[PDB]
Amino acid sequence: KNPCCSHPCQNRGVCMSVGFDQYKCDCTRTGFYGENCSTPEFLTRIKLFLKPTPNTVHYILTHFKGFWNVVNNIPFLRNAIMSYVLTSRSHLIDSPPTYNADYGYKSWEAFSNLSYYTRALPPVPDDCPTPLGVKGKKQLPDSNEIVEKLLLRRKFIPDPQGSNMMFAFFAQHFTHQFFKTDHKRGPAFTNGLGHGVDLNHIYGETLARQRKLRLFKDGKMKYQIIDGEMYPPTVKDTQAEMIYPPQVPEHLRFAVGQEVFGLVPGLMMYATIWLREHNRVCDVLKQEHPEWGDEQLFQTSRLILIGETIKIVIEDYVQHLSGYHFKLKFDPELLFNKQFQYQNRIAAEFNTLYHWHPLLPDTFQIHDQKYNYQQFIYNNSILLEHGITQFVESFTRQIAGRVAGGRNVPPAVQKVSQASIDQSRQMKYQSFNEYRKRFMLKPYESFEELTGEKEMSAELEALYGDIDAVELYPALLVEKPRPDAIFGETMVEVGAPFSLKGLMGNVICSPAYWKPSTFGGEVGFQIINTASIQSLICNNVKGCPFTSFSVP
Amino acid sequence: KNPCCSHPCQNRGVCMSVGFDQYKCDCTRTGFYGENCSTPEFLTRIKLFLKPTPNTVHYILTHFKGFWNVVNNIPFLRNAIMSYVLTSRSHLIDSPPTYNADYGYKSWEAFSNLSYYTRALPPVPDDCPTPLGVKGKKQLPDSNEIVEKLLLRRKFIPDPQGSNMMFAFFAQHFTHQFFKTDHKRGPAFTNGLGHGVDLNHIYGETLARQRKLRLFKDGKMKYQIIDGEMYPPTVKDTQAEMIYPPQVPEHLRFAVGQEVFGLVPGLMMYATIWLREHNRVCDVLKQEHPEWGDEQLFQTSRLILIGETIKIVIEDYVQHLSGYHFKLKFDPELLFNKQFQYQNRIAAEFNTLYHWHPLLPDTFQIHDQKYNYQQFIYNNSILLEHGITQFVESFTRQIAGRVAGGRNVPPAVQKVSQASIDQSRQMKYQSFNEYRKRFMLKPYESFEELTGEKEMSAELEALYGDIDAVELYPALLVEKPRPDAIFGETMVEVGAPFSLKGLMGNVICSPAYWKPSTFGGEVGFQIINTASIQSLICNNVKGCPFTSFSVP
Ligand code: COH
Ligand code: COH
Ligand SMILES: *[C@@H]1O[C@H](CO)[C@@H](O[C@@H]2O[C@H](CO)[C@@H](O[C@H]3O[C@H](CO)[C@@H](O)[C@H](O)[C@@H]3O)[C@H](O)[C@H]2NC(C)=O)[C@H](O)[C@H]1NC(C)=O
Ligand SMILES: *[C@@H]1O[C@H](CO)[C@@H](O[C@@H]2O[C@H](CO)[C@@H](O[C@H]3O[C@H](CO)[C@@H](O)[C@H](O)[C@@H]3O)[C@H](O)[C@H]2NC(C)=O)[C@H](O)[C@H]1NC(C)=O
Ligand SMILES: *[C@@H]1O[C@H](CO)[C@@H](O[C@@H]2O[C@H](CO)[C@@H](O)[C@H](O)[C@H]2NC(C)=O)[C@H](O)[C@H]1NC(C)=O
Ligand SMILES: CCCCCCCCO[C@@H]1O[C@H](CO)[C@@H](O)[C@H](O)[C@H]1O
Ligand SMILES: *[C@@H]1O[C@H](CO)[C@@H](O)[C@H](O)[C@H]1NC(C)=O
Ligand SMILES: *[C@@H]1O[C@H](CO)[C@@H](O)[C@H](O)[C@H]1NC(C)=O
Ligand SMILES: *[C@@H]1O[C@H](CO)[C@@H](O)[C@H](O)[C@H]1NC(C)=O
């Protein structure tokens, strides 16, 4: 019986066993002291007393529109506030990384082996009184029963923030470059060895695959013209492997950076758009540098698209999610006078937290047509029939589902929801409340406090028994949403540090990289700093249709 | 005719071609402006006028012994001084890394591909008038003529700092965990994907190899008992690949972390010593943690040995090399309030700089025996015959050769010296003076100034014709040595930044790692804080013989 099974060390203290039945807490630089690191120093009490709650800060950022309008248009003020948002978030992240699924203590194996997802909290020891430590019952509830009673959609619940399918598929497309679970190996392992925004889902994970996708003229990527429009090349032509069922004919097997993007037309849509953007940038650079060769044109274009991606994700994507009247800003210079590590390791909990299944609709609405899940998946024929323009117009206006609030997961992906729970247990995640404490949030003291409701909280009580036994994934989906919001508190407060760290931690944001020469001059640099979700569609989609991450 | 062939940009500005006929210098954050980044800004002019020369600083640090004795014993001042030497040196290194042999511009391939050595200076462009850019003759002088006329040892020149064989072999053993050139692939590539002090030369580069070397009992590494003492296991026993010529019998084919360490008995000596130290620490930790399993004992011991290594390298190895009266200090906490990147990429020029062939003696004296290179190389029988105790006593008393000053490379390793020159040209190194400017040193204006002597300078002038045409590796070895020192100015001013950055950049120095719990408690921390070259030998060599990096 491991002495640290009770997770006795508080406030990010480190538990270490000293003997078979005793433990010791390392309170170094926690701001606390005592046996469990639970007694605050003088300075710590003052900081705590003066620290406003996340909900308070959230209220201020989502109100006083007249105030933020002025702040947004004064760089001095906007920079100082954005600088605060960045610094205070990333400090909750261990960098360089620490634990993974196989190590609850610091080890060189955990640090050096990039095949693992890292871990924000160490795994629960193998031999503990309960699966989660000491709290709860000897056996966790049946994972399918959790999904059915708490997560399954009885009736479609639209997102009150108005997120659309353009947002939903952007989210899936973007995150699947660093969420690349090596399932044949196990949920603890990833294929994304770059561990961040490298755009491997466009260019490929290895040089061998990249060379299959490249045209080797003017720095461009291979493509084909169908009905006058640019689309990805075929598998037969590139010999770049893709995941396709037998029923998909050869001429419809599109080859892109990510092997699984043929699964759903929504992904292939963004894959096509980003492909168009790369070759567009190549033309721009070739005009600016007629002396450059194919290789430098390719490499510089890739760096620019990485910049565009981070720019769009912060100022459009995260901006939409936050609901802030304050306008977030992508500016690496904000950190040049701060302590910050330019590196990133993808955490398993970050992956799990991003299982935003409830976003998915009951049917997919393209033009005047509707498709069920069986018709939609692996169906590139739909994409060619309607075209990218029609796809953009339809997805922009189709609303997505609310993620928090419970019971909004489509039955079509019921087994996927269960898988998230099963894998979480396989990797021995700690409880939901342990993760709330890990990110300096007060733990919930009752099921009713979690959901803000009596029905689902009663079912939670019947299943888990104790609030400290509730698991991470289901609790995130049943958590009381913030007022008219898509998420609950925990989703934001745990997710934002991971998100922002991986964005600003990118190498191109470092002082040695963030300069005009890196991107082929001011022309390439400007492409990055003026990028938006609207400009991406306008530049690469016929007719330049209106688009947004929110419904009109 | 690349317009950047002349390397027009000064002070670490970035050169970029604009059209076929012109270039543009990016002076971002160089502290300079103008077309070539040559004109200093206001504060820059001030800092220049208030900053002394490295030779002036070196004088101060090597004199006023009574003064430094006072300084060394007042922690607050000693910490401030040591903090400054860490931050100022590491600032000259690009981190995250930039260029490599294949990329003279920033690219994702250069950043992400760990198989390359990184580069402090970008390679000379392919289409330049001269091999070095625009300076010098169209063809570089014969590499063998350079070795013969300038580098080959006539009479043995001993190190005036009194470095011994314990020092020479420690340097080779220590640096060959990150200097691991993949010669079958090219000099531009490395097998040390950890790019630093991971002690892979003990434990192996991969997990597969590590498992072959581990005992899986009490966290220990496999070993055998010969004549009552601990030695590495064999290849036959472990099935771990080693590089050995056919004439080496099976029982003399020892298996260690680094595949080439069977090449020299001096390397196998330190391999044996560090092996013993691992198993020693395992015994200490097991006494402290009876509840721990094999895996935790192994991993914790490895972290401790990494700590010991960095401690010894700073406070004994670099301390001896420097010749300073100021006492250097290994203390990660010195950087906790500073801007510092906890990562490292091994530079090709750092490798070339560390080719300290002149250290090698004419013969290897062990007890009453003398061995030439034919008798010594790949001869592990010598190690077993004398034992580690006799090895330590002999090598402690045998003096090493002077590195700078020219004409001190043993003819036995003549081709190695030629290979260093050939590989540098193959990797398209820039000139010696370009690298001086890269590390804020003034360029030599004449051969006579470089050598401080009329003989070899005349030979240099005949070979190269231009001082700006002299290559990095030959100039390092012929440079005028500092008064009674082993090195010249450039070796120290270029070498120290790379060296210190790789040491303090280590992850165990990071705030999240530098705490007692990481090393198994206070006992693990004390092992590190009490580490020395003396204690390393005393703890693991029979009889506890005295040792040092200098001749008694
Ligand atoms: C963030 C938004 C998001 C969306 C909109 C979305 C939309 C959809 C969708 C739309 C038609 C379908 C059929 C599915 C179905 C799946 N999802 Co998602 N998923 C999303 C987030 C994720 C994440 C994150 C994972 C884990 C990936 C991993 O570990 O490789 C995931 C995994 C899966 C898997 C497991 C295999 C795999 O994808 O590698 C299936 C199947 N799914 N999901
Ligand atoms: C303290 C520095 C030091 C020492 C003591 C030392 C001592 C000895 C020694 C007997 C003691 C012998 C027989 C050799 C012989 C060789 N050394 Co060194 N070498 C040293 C510094 C280096 C470095 C640096 C390299 C290149 C590392 C790489 O790329 O693998 C090297 C590589 C070599 C090579 C391969 C060529 C090459 O990598 O370019 C041979 C052969 N050698 N050396
Ligand atoms: C430091 O953390 C310790 C671990 O959480 C904590 O010990 C825990 O104390 C609680 C109550 O104080 C115990 O909870 C149960 O105790 C008995 C079982 O012996 C039950 O009858 C109770 O109803 C209650 O459910 C935990 O069992 C106990 N955990 C241990 C000992 O591992 C310490 O109190 C903490 N110390 C400080 C100063 O905060
Ligand atoms: C890091 O850069 C390495 C150097 O570019 C790169 O190694 C190269 O890998 C490719 C593809 O694996 C090899 O390409 C061809 O190799 C042989 C020719 O010798 C062909 O028969 C194959 O079919 C293949 O097309 C290169 O040979 C190889 N080059 C070298 C010098 O090793 C690595 O792949 C890069 N690392 C990553 C992770 O991408
Ligand atoms: C990173 O960790 C994984 C998992 O431990 C290592 O993969 C194992 O490698 C050994 C030896 O090659 C195999 O016998 C196992 O079957 C592998 N396990 C799995 C789950 O794949 C991997 O080798 C490690 N990476 C490195 C570079 O050592
Ligand atoms: C869409 C429902 C599929 C799963 C049904 C079996 C699990 C029981 O689901 C039940 O659903 C009821 C109506 O939503 C709820 O009121 C109950 O709390 C819940 O237990
Ligand atoms: C895919 O979508 C098309 C719509 O163009 C439809 O005709 C077809 O039946 C769908 N299913 C497939 C191809 O399995
Ligand atoms: C910059 O350097 C180039 C080549 O070294 C030289 O021709 C040019 O005159 C320099 N420009 C200035 C402004 O000094
Ligand atoms: C190796 O050393 C042994 C003595 O230790 C000696 O007898 C033998 O000749 C040496 N080998 C060579 C090739 O010189």
Half-sphere exposure of A227 (CA within 13 A, CB side): 8
DSSP string, B218-274: TTPBP-EEETTEEEPPBHHHH-------TTS-GGG-B--SSTTTTS-HHHHHHHHHH
Q: Which two tokens stand for residue A196?
A: 């961040």
Q: Is B203 exposed, middle or buried (0-12, 13-18, 19+ CB in 10 A)?
A: buried
Which residues in chain B have Cβ-Cβ distances shorter than 8 Å to A513?
96, 98, 106
Technique that determined the structure: X-ray
Nearest to A328, CA basis, from A41, A72, A57, A504: A72
Nearest to B508, CA basis, from A462, A96, A217: A96
Q: Which two tokens stand for residue B30?
A: 């160089």
- Which of B15, B108, B341 is facing A303, going by the closest CB pair? B108
Geometric angle at alpha carbon B439, from B437 and B443, rounded to 5°: 30
- Cα–Cα distance for residue pair A263/A201, rounded to 1 Å: 14
Geometric angle at alpha carbon B429, from B428 and B432, rounded to 5°: 150
- Cα–Cα distance for residue pair B107/A518, rounded to 1 Å: 8
Nearest to B133, CA basis, from B142, B118, B146, B123: B123
* Ligand 8 atom with the shortest distance to the CA of B38: 14
Q: Is B408 exposed, middle or buried (0-12, 13-18, 19+ CB in 10 A)?
A: buried
Sign of the C-alpha dihedral computed for residues B533, B535, B536 and B541 taken in this order = positive
**Cβ–ligand 2 contact at B173 (below 6 Å):** no
CB atoms within 10 A of CB A323: 18
Residue located nearest, by CA, to atom 26 of ligand 3:
A6
B176 is catalytic: yes
Angle in degrees, 0-180, between the axes of helices A522-529 and A265-288, rounded to the nearest 10: 150
User: Catalytic: which of A7, A58, A173, A176?
Assistant: A176
Which residues in chain A have Cβ-Cβ distances shorter than 8 Å to B512?
94-96, 98
**Cβ–ligand 7 contact at A379 (below 6 Å):** yes
Q: Give the closest-approach CA distance of B229 to chain A in angstroms.
A: 29
How many A from CA of A321 to the centre of ligand 2?
57
Geometric angle at alpha carbon B323, from B319 and B325, rounded to 5°: 85
- Cα–Cα distance for residue pair B438/B93, rounded to 1 Å: 10
CB atoms within 10 A of CB B28: 16
For A230, list phi and psi in degrees, rounded to 5. Answer: -85, 130
Sign of the C-alpha dihedral computed for residues A121, A124, A126 and A131 taken in this order = negative
φ/ψ region of A395 (left if φ > 0, alpha if ψ in -120 to 50, else beta) reads: alpha
Residues 6+ apart with CB under 8 A from A88: none
Give the closest ligand to the alpha carbon of residue A194.
Answer: 4
* Kind of pairing between the strands at A39-40 and A32-33: antiparallel
- Cα–Cα distance for residue pair B256/B278, rounded to 1 Å: 13
Would you call A516 and B109 a contact, using CB atoms and an 8 Å cutoff? no
Residue of A nearest to B20 (CA): A291
Sign of the C-alpha dihedral computed for residues B403, B404, B408 and B414 taken in this order = positive
* Ligand 6 atom with the shortest distance to the CA of A458: 18
Is residue B199 within 8 A of residue B190, CB to CB? The reply is no
CB atoms within 10 A of CB A369: 14
**Cβ–ligand 5 contact at B208 (below 6 Å):** yes
**Cβ–ligand 3 contact at A466 (below 6 Å):** no
- Cα–Cα distance for residue pair B383/B360, rounded to 1 Å: 18
**Cβ–ligand 5 contact at A442 (below 6 Å):** no
B89 assigned ligand-binding residue: yes
Backbone discontinuities in chain A, residue before each (C to N > 2.5 A) = none
Nearest to A527, CA basis, from A211, A174, A287, A193: A287
Nearest to B141, CA basis, from B475, B480, B455, B489: B475
Which residues in chain A have Cβ-Cβ distances shorter than 8 Å to B19?
289-291
Helix (H) or strand (E) holding A369: strand A369-371
Residues 6+ apart with CB under 8 A from B417: B147, B151, B152, B355, B357, B409
A357 assigned ligand-binding residue: yes
Amino acid in position A55: N
Is residue A176 within 8 A of residue A271, CB to CB? The reply is no
Residue spans in chain A of domains classed CATH 2.10.25.10: 1-41
Is residue B269 within 8 A of residue B388, CB to CB? The reply is yes
Best residue among B103, B115, B116 to mutate for probing ligand 4, ranked by most atoms within 8 Å of CB:
B115
- Cα–Cα distance for residue pair A32/A48, rounded to 1 Å: 12
Geometric angle at alpha carbon A464, from A460 and A467, rounded to 5°: 80
Q: How far is CA B524 from the centre of its chain?
A: 27
User: Hey, which residues does B17 pair with through a beta bridge?
Assistant: B23
Is residue B377 within 8 A of residue B144, CB to CB? The reply is no
Which residues in chain A have Cβ-Cβ distances shorter than 8 Å to B302?
107-108
Is residue A523 within 8 A of residue B22, CB to CB? The reply is no
How many A from CA of A359 to the centre of ligand 1?
11
Which residues in chain A have Cβ-Cβ distances shorter than 8 Å to B113?
207
Is residue A6 within 8 A of residue A134, CB to CB? The reply is yes
How many A from CA of A385 to the centre of ligand 7?
10
Would you call B109 and A299 a contact, using CB atoms and an 8 Å cutoff? yes
Nearest to B335, CA basis, from B500, B518, B498, B496: B500
User: Catalytic: which of A117, A354, A435, A464?
Assistant: A354
- Cα–Cα distance for residue pair B108/A206, rounded to 1 Å: 12
* Ligand 3 atom with the shortest distance to the CA of A35: 38
Output the CA–CA distances (angstroms, integers) from residue B106 to A209, A295, A302, A473, in the order listed. 21, 12, 11, 40
Helix (H) or strand (E) holding A17: strand A14-17
Q: Which two tokens stand for residue A294?
A: 């194919």
- Cα–Cα distance for residue pair B242/B260, rounded to 1 Å: 7
Q: Give the closest-approach CA distance of A480 to chain B in angstroms.
A: 33
**Cβ–ligand 2 contact at B172 (below 6 Å):** yes
B185 assigned ligand-binding residue: no
SS3 state of residue A365:
strand
Chain A contact probe: residue of B116, B195, B291 with most A CBs at under 10 A: B291
- Cα–Cα distance for residue pair A363/A371, rounded to 1 Å: 5
CB atoms within 10 A of CB B35: 13
Q: Which two tokens stand for residue A236?
A: 């037969």
* Ligand 7 atom with the shortest distance to the CA of A382: 5
- Cα–Cα distance for residue pair A476/A31, rounded to 1 Å: 29
Place of tokens 């104790």: A466
Helix (H) or strand (E) holding A86: helix A75-90
DSSP string, B402-451: PSSSSS-B-GGGHHHHHHHHHHHHHTTPPPHHHHHHHTTPPPPSSHHHHH
Nearest to A374, CA basis, from A363, A385, A366: A363
A42-552: which CATH architecture?
Answer: Orthogonal Bundle (1.10)
Residue of A nearest to B288 (CA): A18
How many A from CA of A518 to the centre of ligand 1?
34
Amino acid in position A46: I
Residue spans in chain A of domains classed CATH 1.10.640.10: 42-552
Amino acid in position B309: T
How many A from CA of A256 to the centre of ligand 1?
17
Q: Is B127 exposed, middle or buried (0-12, 13-18, 19+ CB in 10 A)?
A: exposed
- Cα–Cα distance for residue pair B433/B471, rounded to 1 Å: 8
Give A37's DSSP letter: S
Place of tokens 């999240």: B512
**Cβ–ligand 2 contact at B171 (below 6 Å):** yes
DSSP string, B22-45: EEEEE-TTSSEESTTS-EE-HHHH
Best residue among A203, A207, A213 to mutate for probing ligand 4, ranked by most atoms within 8 Å of CB:
A207
Q: Which two tokens stand for residue A541?
A: 């989609």
Is residue A212 within 8 A of residue A240, CB to CB? The reply is yes
Residue of B nearest to A111 (CA): B507
Is residue B474 within 8 A of residue B150, CB to CB? The reply is yes
In chain A, what is the straight-line distance between the N-terminal and C-terminal CA atoms, in Å?
A: 57
Which residues in chain B have Cβ-Cβ distances shorter than 8 Å to A26?
515-517
DSSP string, B459-479: HHHHHHSSGGG--HHHHHHHS
For A475, list phi and psi in degrees, rounded to 5. Answer: -65, -35
**Cβ–ligand 1 contact at A260 (below 6 Å):** yes
SS3 state of residue A370:
strand
Place of tokens 């020159």: B421
Homologous superfamily (CATH) of A1-41 is: Laminin (2.10.25.10)
User: Catalytic: which of B7, B58, B173, B176?
Assistant: B176
- Cα–Cα distance for residue pair A360/A392, rounded to 1 Å: 16
- Cα–Cα distance for residue pair B232/B203, rounded to 1 Å: 12
Would you call A516 and B106 a contact, using CB atoms and an 8 Å cutoff? no
How many A from CA of B17 to the centre of ligand 2?
38
